[PDB]
Amino acid sequence: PIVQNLQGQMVHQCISPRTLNAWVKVVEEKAFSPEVIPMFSALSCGATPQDLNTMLNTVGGHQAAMQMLKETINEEAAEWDRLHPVHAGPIAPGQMREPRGSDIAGTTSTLQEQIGWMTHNPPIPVGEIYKRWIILGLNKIVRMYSPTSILDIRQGPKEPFRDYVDRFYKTLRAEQASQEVKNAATETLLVQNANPDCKTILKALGPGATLEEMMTACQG
Amino acid sequence: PIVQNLQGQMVHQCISPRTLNAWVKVVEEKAFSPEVIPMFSALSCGATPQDLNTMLNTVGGHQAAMQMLKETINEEAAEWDRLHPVHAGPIAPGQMREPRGSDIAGTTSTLQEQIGWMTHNPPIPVGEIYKRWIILGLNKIVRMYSPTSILDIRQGPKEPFRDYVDRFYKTLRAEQASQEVKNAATETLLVQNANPDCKTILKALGPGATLEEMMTACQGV
Amino acid sequence: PIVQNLQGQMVHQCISPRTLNAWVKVVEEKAFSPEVIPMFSALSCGATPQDLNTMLNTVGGHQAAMQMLKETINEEAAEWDRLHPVHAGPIAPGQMREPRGSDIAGTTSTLQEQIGWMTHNPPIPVGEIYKRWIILGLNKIVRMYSPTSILDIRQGPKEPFRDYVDRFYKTLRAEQASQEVKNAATETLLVQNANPDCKTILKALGPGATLEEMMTACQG
Amino acid sequence: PIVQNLQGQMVHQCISPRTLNAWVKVVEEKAFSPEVIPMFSALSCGATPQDLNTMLNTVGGHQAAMQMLKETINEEAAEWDRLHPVHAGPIAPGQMREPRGSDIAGTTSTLQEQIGWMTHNPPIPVGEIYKRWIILGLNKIVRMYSPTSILDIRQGPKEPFRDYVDRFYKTLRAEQASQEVKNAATETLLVQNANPDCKTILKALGPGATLEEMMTACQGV
Amino acid sequence: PIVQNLQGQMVHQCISPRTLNAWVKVVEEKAFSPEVIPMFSALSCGATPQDLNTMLNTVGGHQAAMQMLKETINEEAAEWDRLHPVHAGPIAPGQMREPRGSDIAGTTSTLQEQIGWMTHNPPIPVGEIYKRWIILGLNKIVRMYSPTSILDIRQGPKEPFRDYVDRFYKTLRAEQASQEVKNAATETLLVQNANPDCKTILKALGPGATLEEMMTACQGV
Amino acid sequence: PIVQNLQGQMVHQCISPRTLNAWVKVVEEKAFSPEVIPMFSALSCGATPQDLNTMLNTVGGHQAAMQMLKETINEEAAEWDRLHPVHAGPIAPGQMREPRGSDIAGTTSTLQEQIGWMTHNPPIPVGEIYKRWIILGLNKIVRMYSPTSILDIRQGPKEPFRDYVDRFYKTLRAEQASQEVKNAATETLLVQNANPDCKTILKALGPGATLEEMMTACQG
Ligand SMILES: CCS(=O)(=O)Nc1nn(CC(F)(F)F)c2c(-n3c([C@H](Cc4cc(F)cc(F)c4)NC(=O)Cn4nc(C(F)(F)F)c5c4CCC5)nc4cc(-c5ccc(C=O)c(F)c5)ccc4c3=O)ccc(Cl)c12
Ligand SMILES: CCS(=O)(=O)Nc1nn(CC(F)(F)F)c2c(-n3c([C@H](Cc4cc(F)cc(F)c4)NC(=O)Cn4nc(C(F)(F)F)c5c4CCC5)nc4cc(-c5ccc(C=O)c(F)c5)ccc4c3=O)ccc(Cl)c12
Ligand SMILES: CCS(=O)(=O)Nc1nn(CC(F)(F)F)c2c(-n3c([C@H](Cc4cc(F)cc(F)c4)NC(=O)Cn4nc(C(F)(F)F)c5c4CCC5)nc4cc(-c5ccc(C=O)c(F)c5)ccc4c3=O)ccc(Cl)c12
Ligand SMILES: CCS(=O)(=O)Nc1nn(CC(F)(F)F)c2c(-n3c([C@H](Cc4cc(F)cc(F)c4)NC(=O)Cn4nc(C(F)(F)F)c5c4CCC5)nc4cc(-c5ccc(C=O)c(F)c5)ccc4c3=O)ccc(Cl)c12
Ligand SMILES: CCS(=O)(=O)Nc1nn(CC(F)(F)F)c2c(-n3c([C@H](Cc4cc(F)cc(F)c4)NC(=O)Cn4nc(C(F)(F)F)c5c4CCC5)nc4cc(-c5ccc(C=O)c(F)c5)ccc4c3=O)ccc(Cl)c12
């Protein structure tokens, strides 16, 4: 990673054995449950492209997913190249060549170049750009290994309303839509997929009941 | 988190794997037992909004609780906005735009903005403000998911007084109320709901007895 | 905690996940065995009142004990208030308001105030004062969850003298008396509660035998 | 390893017990699965030749592989020597003798010489040069100890396409070849070795379909 | 402990949870096996008296041993007091009162006094002096709780000589005696208490044989 | 150990609980398998003589081996004394007495003297010298607890050639000879001890086949 030391300077540090192991274990234990994304995001804080590639290369199995991720990266890289074309010419002392997409993904760039960009004044944050690409791919994978649509989450006749709501929002976490789309669909669908006794009570509350009010109302 | 270096400046440090894992495991092991709240507060010391979002996003399951938490945050954010409305205009050099509620929650703010607020002179402690909102939400969840009401804690005929007291205060810990209200509940119910023999002993020691005295007086009864 | 950094200045640091976990595990594993006190004392090295409250708030169960602790704190705080009454008036630049008992316990004081006191020149060590109150309460709890009096520790007829002595002093650790009182009672009671064959030998050694001499003498 | 201190100088640090143990355990648990290679590369970041030798010397068992690794290193060392022959003469103050192949591998060089190379201005990165040799050797071992050939990965009649793709790329990961060669193997075999129903679907999407599209198109077939 | 910072000054650091737990677990697992002594000495490196008291206070059980340890300390403290009596009078600025035995053991001294002694120029190393007393006490305990006497270590008829030697030196390790005395015990008993066949072989190699030679000579006998 | 701090100075640090535990566990788990030597070497990086003695004193059991180690140290120390005799006289301010062998082994030297030597300009690296002595002894012990000669490692009739080669080189790791002696013996002995079907194929390859070529040739 690139971190600040105790004396106020951005420096390169080795990825730690703890970080590496934390990520490997997360994938082993949880596969591509939604929570693997914020865990990846937090474990990769400060990462260079080389560090990100290391993390992705240590994933055991799941190589269909990992290839889909490479394809997502390649599409983002091609968009970057269209938007930020490289001008040819000798690079001046006191300057860094402009990165292409393949450089941000660490494929055609050296570690020294990556540090150069990430610590330039002003910085070209190739780590952060690459990470955003990876997260877009990881979201696709989460959605793909999600077994269930929110349309199929229905409260059972004897199912406590809290357990139903737990299942509903856990399923929703795996959907790949904006938060606004998720929320408004949810309002109405949560009621619609409730069991007849709860649905009755929930209709009675009227629009604009908070979840807390809903869960109190259907406690038994 | 934001921590101080040797130069005496506040700077950003990455959240540690140890922290992340400690939080994940505490939720796994304890759910929304009252002690999850101080563990959250301790593990999130110095946290940015981004860090707090990370910690909440890694909670496995309990999504009904997490959704109720978001709703609490949205309520606290609307109030923030009502009390502290943003004034339009360009931001001066070395200065920071005023945060809206959604900026404090990390939704409409970048990491670099959060660092800027938390390290400005004087600080706008958006991490601390957000943590307060989160803790309020967690207190609701703890209460919400408490199985027992304090009114139903009654000493059994053969139950040692110490075990009853343990159960009474464990229940009271999950209530969402000020300390002064919880002290009123104790004064109303603890002696009253003791069993007949202990109750007789306790009524005799009177209102002013310490818990240690009460527990000594009922050691056999 | 408040610690010294590498460059010679008292600064606030976050309580570490290790410290938190060590304390939680100690209580889970050992409850209020006497050794929990020096473990609390060592894990709370440098603690602010806020840190101490955190540690106490993480104790799972044992809420009768924890309430007795709060009552002990309140009594110590009232004594502090009697001994160190607060004078009213505006606080000068370059000064800290005088702490009341409720401030030392962290109830009516902010973290910023606690750091202010603990790093003033000269320091008001509100962490150390509060800790002393907590330890007084913890000692009361140890004594309370001690099942056995030293008067009931008697060497059995076939019990190796070493096992008896182990039981005796382990029980004595849980008693709440001064060390002088513990020692002198012990001299005589250890002999008196020994089994008839050992008691014979121990009488024969005369007064002022060390424990080592006693344990050698009753080895079989 | 060689790491930077506050003065901005590169200095020597002892290899940590955590690092040592992480490497030992990864070999124990995963043998020469492809993912052992990036784990080695990450755990050996900043390593001196001495450190790399330590890590290789602590591998338990697998001595046939380790001997093949030494042979690869000896081949790379002979080539180094052919490209970069040492010139005789006394070494000037503040300067370092030019390394031979055996110096890079840590066999004929002291720790103090390795530090001198890695911290000189500009660096002679003998740790990085040796790591490259080691990684080449490990890639041979991974391939050598792979059980399956890519030609024998064929989708079963009832095998979900996702499971076949997992197996195909897991096999391809163990091949020792450039990325461009591995991409050629995919273009030759993946659709061709799908089962009859999936293959029909995939041939219709055509050469330009992404894996995500292919996996959507065969979700039931 | 007292450790050095960057300014090259000795300063106080809190005892770490790792240290505390390592000590607790070593006693739990090994009791008063001889190797507990160097583990104590290593874990208490730089310790103040306060720290040493903490480590001793966390020992679970073994209170007969711990009481014998206190008695040893009291004996060493009385001797200290006899050799180094305190002189009355007010302490000058930047100076420290002379420690009594009970000050070294941490009983009548504050932490701030201990820091003052250990960091004064020149140091009064009250941590090191106390550790010496503690180690003397622990050596007594190890000996006290050793099950076997060296006189009873005898090679069995079918016991490999290496196993006998292991047992002989493991027993000798628990003895409380100088190294020169332990070397005398070896010269008296090791060959003498070997079985008839090994003994014959060993007597022939003679007094000057190394252990490695002795163990080679008896590899089958 | 003696390490460099962040501000470029050689200082003494306490041996860490991690280091201590790593070494204890290695011996418990692996005894004196060859890999215990590079593990000792790496865990003792920067060690003083006192640290090395600590590490050796924590070894549980294996006291025959440990005594053989002391004997090896004593022989190396006597050689050092013959080669570097100590001249008598008062030691000047700005100087360190010359170390004898017993000083390098930490037996007659204080920690303060060891730090003095290791941080003198120019350094007398008593830690590194002692470690070399210990490693010579440890190699003797490895060879001694090795159950098997390389002459007895023979490929079985149905044994995969890779498993045979694994056994052969694992056995060779425990032999105490130079690397040149190990290699040249190995070339020929590996073929000679192969089973008849492999030996046939290996003869056919001719001299100077690499191991990789040999293992490919006998894959079935
Ligand atoms: C033609 C280019 S492309 O294919 O379109 N895109 C890319 N190719 N590469 C890899 C490369 F750089 F090599 F071209 C790309 C990398 N890439 C990679 C990637 C990282 C990755 C793994 C993953 F699981 C998912 C991902 F999304 C990304 N690893 C692999 O591709 C391994 N692989 N291999 C096959 C398979 F082939 F076996 F099937 C599969 C996989 C994962 C899924 C299936 N590792 C590196 C390691 C060192 C590096 C360098 C040195 C050392 C040691 O000294 C070291 F350990 C590592 C240096 C540079 C790179 C680097 O740039 C990044 C991004 C793109 Cl988009 C590509
Ligand atoms: C739209 C307004 S709102 O919904 O009324 N309020 C909020 N929306 N958001 C989320 C968002 F920001 F997306 F709008 C909000 C966040 N928010 C979130 C929150 C954090 C959170 C989780 C939790 F379990 C309880 C909570 F109380 C808070 N995560 C979710 O909402 C996930 N989610 N999702 C569903 C769902 F699927 F059902 F939808 C559920 C959940 C938990 C319960 C059910 N994560 C972030 C991550 C990155 C971030 C940025 C970058 C990376 C990668 O580098 C990364 F990993 C993360 C950047 C910004 C944000 C951010 O701002 C904060 C607060 C509010 Cl109040 C809101
Ligand atoms: C009228 C005052 S008093 O009651 O006489 N004395 C005290 N009240 N308080 C608590 C308070 F401050 F709230 F008044 C007191 C505290 N106190 C507490 C204490 C700590 C404690 C726990 C314990 F197990 C034993 C103890 F001895 C002490 N916690 C509780 O009381 C919890 N509780 N709750 C009930 C029960 F009610 F459910 F039954 C029980 C318990 C333990 C036993 C049974 N936590 C804090 C947390 C934040 C803090 C602030 C913010 C956040 C988050 O942002 C956070 F996580 C923590 C800020 C300030 C405080 C603080 O000052 C300290 C000392 C006194 Cl003496 C008192
Ligand atoms: C002679 C030339 S060569 O053989 O062609 N090439 C090499 N010989 N050496 C080793 C040596 F240096 F000794 F010559 C070489 C080393 N080398 C080694 C290597 C490292 C290694 C292990 C491995 F598993 C795979 C590898 F690829 C490399 N260890 C071994 O060879 C052990 N070995 N031993 C047998 C055997 F028993 F079967 F022999 C086997 C093995 C692994 C497979 C089978 N360790 C060192 C340790 C100290 C070192 C120095 C000091 C201390 C103590 O303080 C310490 F612990 C270690 C100092 C210097 C060296 C050093 O230079 C490096 C590279 C080459 Cl190519 C060679
Ligand atoms: C009176 C003179 S003496 O008895 O002859 N010698 C000594 N008395 N003390 C203890 C004392 F200081 F209290 F006098 C002595 C200490 N001593 C102790 C010792 C340490 C110890 C434990 C052990 F297992 C073996 C030992 F050899 C030494 N603990 C005990 O005595 C506990 N104990 N208690 C009984 C008993 F219950 F049976 F009594 C037993 C035992 C072990 C065996 C049986 N702890 C301290 C803690 C705080 C300290 C201060 C503050 C806090 C909190 O913040 C804290 F947690 C701790 C501050 C000061 C002290 C301190 O000075 C040191 C040395 C002497 Cl020689 C004596």
Ligand SMILES: CCS(=O)(=O)Nc1nn(CC(F)(F)F)c2c(-n3c([C@H](Cc4cc(F)cc(F)c4)NC(=O)Cn4nc(C(F)(F)F)c5c4CCC5)nc4cc(-c5ccc(C=O)c(F)c5)ccc4c3=O)ccc(Cl)c12
């Ligand atoms: C006449 C000298 S010699 O015998 O020829 N050589 C040596 N004697 N010593 C030890 C000594 F220094 F004491 F003389 C020697 C040491 N030596 C030792 C050694 C280390 C060691 C252990 C081991 F397992 C293998 C080894 F190779 C070396 N420990 C023992 O000898 C223990 N022992 N004991 C018996 C047995 F006797 F019970 F059987 C056995 C053993 C291992 C095998 C069988 N520990 C020290 C600890 C403190 C030290 C000082 C203070 C404290 C506490 O405050 C502390 F914890 C440690 C201070 C100084 C020393 C120190 O110098 C080093 C080297 C030589 Cl060659 C010798």
